């Protein structure tokens, strides 16, 4: 698949587009 890297707010923005209408977890670890 695609050779892209994302860090900080750029990784949050990609997760917001893929998941922000369902909800998501951006914390380094959680109870999942």
């Amino acid at each position: 698949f695609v050779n892209q890297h994302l860090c900080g707010s750029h990784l949050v923005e990609a997760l917001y587009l893929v998941c922000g209408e369902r909800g998501f977890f951006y914390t380094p670890k959680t109870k999942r």
Binding site: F1, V2, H5, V18, C19, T30
Partner: peptide
């Protein structure tokens, strides 16, 4: 977790869906 997986290696939309609610 989530913050290292695309910063230290590569990710796609199918890998971002791992961090979705569920």
């Amino acid at each position: 977790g989530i913050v290292e997986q695309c910063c230290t290696s590569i990710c796609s939309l199918y890998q971002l869906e791992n961090y979705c609610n569920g």
